[PDB]
Design a protein around this ligand. Sequence first.
Ligand SMILES: C[C@]1(c2ccccc2)C[C@@H](c2cccc(-c3ccc(C(N)=O)cc3C(=O)O)c2)Nc2ccc(C(=N)N)cc21
Length: 238
Amino acid sequence: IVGGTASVRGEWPWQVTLHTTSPTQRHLCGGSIIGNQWILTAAHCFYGVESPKILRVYSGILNQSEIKEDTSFFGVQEIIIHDQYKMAESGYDIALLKLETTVNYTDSQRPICLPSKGDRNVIYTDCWVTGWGYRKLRDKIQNTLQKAKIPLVTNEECQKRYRGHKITHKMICAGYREGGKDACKGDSGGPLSCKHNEVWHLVGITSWGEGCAQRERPGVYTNVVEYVDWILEKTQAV
Ligand SMILES: C[C@]1(c2ccccc2)C[C@@H](c2cccc(-c3ccc(C(N)=O)cc3C(=O)O)c2)Nc2ccc(C(=N)N)cc21
């Protein structure tokens, strides 16, 4: 996250850090708790990941330094990638991780509400992007979870900023016309959370952009409302 600040412990209880074990243990991508055995993340985070066996999900983490070999985590039983996914820039940058065990909800770890089918009409004014990603271009994974308040922008306005690309309605953009605040490398899969009627909702999933936090280049997110049926299909399967 560029131009944001250190989070407070327990501020984003749905935020997870998705780690890989092979080659070495490290943070791979963000994610969100959406069910007691479900993580909503981005499909591009699995490029080259040949097995769910090398994955570890950590919830209730503020600092990456909290994670050692003795730290409790959730194993990944199944990686569910949208079957229309080709690449981040073309859309369908969404995936579901079925966890091996149940997440027991606490004040440190609980789920974020998915948007409503009637919430297509709503205008969100308080949207925040969070993650352990880069705060600058050539950087490293951050220790402390970072946060930034970013305004949502219309599809038409986002299309004007992305000549040569096709901003689909399954995409949602957020950014300041002068830049300065955005998600960056390492933040993918993580949430774009909007508070509406004192209720937080998972509006977006960090996906792509042109560099990070540049002027007239708002970050592109997976538009969660447009995937509620797909999510229910995968999670509520008989
Ligand atoms: C386009 C892109 C970008 C372009 C130019 C400069 C900086 C970033 C890169 C894209 C991407 C694609 C494939 C892999 C990675 C990746 C690699 C390593 C690790 C790791 N943990 O070591 C994590 C990740 C991860 O998936 O973040 C990232 N993700 C993204 C998301 C949001 C914004 C944005 N500005 N809103 C920009 C970007």
